[PDB]
UniProtKB/Swiss-Prot annotation:
This is Oxidized purine nucleoside triphosphate hydrolase. Widely expressed with highest expression in thymus, testis, embryo and proliferating blood lymphocytes. N(6)-methyl-AMP binds at T6, K21, W115, P116, D117, D118. Changing T153A: Reduces 2-oxo-dATPase and 8-oxo-dGTPase activities and increases thermolability. InterPro entries: 8ODP, Nudix_hydrolase, NUDIX_hydrolase-like_dom_sf, NUDIX_hydrolase_CS, NUDIX_hydrolase_dom. GO terms for cellular component: cytoplasm; cytosol; mitochondrial matrix; mitochondrion; nucleus. The keyword Nucleus applies.
Length: 154
């Protein structure tokens, strides 16, 4: 009962790019860039497309860094989120009516205004670790339970 999604973090040695979504799912939080994977598209090509569509950047190499399954209690469909990072981009982030991108220094990551799971796995991403996670939410603000482990391959 799972649907594929991508999430891409643009992570340079001293800063990370995040976007504030204006509407829809996740509005009002900072997050990486991503969305649903399409019919006939690989997960990685989906990740590249969503980065490009939502941020305006052009990405060359993407690196798999994690997989997180999200459950919302009562909702049948699980979100199977494939997480990628890149430090090899072209262009400048573009603010649109849907998305406002902003660079953050690594010691000023805005965890209080991000999805609450990010506090758990972002520190792993920043230390170049790979991970498998599962988070069970009740509504959008409450983590009921979770698992998170480091892995050598995603
Ligand atoms: C429930 C949930 C979903 C997503 C998501 C959907 C599509 C891409 O990511 C999240 O992203 C983060 N950082 N927490 C998240 C929680």
């Amino acid at each position: 009962a799972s649907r594929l999604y991508t999430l891409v973090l643009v992570l340079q040695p001293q800063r990370v790019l995040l976007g504030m979504k204006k509407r829809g799912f996740g509005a009002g939080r900072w997050n990486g860039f991503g969305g649903k994977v399409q019919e006939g598209e690989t997960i990685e090509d989906g990740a590249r497309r969503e980065l490009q569509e939502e941020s305006g950047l052009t990405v060359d190499a993407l690196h798999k860094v994690g997989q997180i399954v999200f459950e919302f209690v009562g909702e049948p469909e699980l979100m199977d989120v494939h997480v990628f990072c890149t430090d090899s981009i072209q262009g400048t982030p573009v603010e649109s009516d849907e998305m406002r991108p902003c660079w953050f220094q690594l010691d000023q990551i805005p965890f209080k205004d991000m999805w609450p799971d990010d506090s758990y796995w972002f520190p792993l991403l920043l230390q170049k670790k790979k991970f498998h996670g599962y988070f069970k939410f009740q509504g959008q603000d409450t983590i009921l339970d979770y698992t998170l482990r480091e892995v050598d391959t995603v």
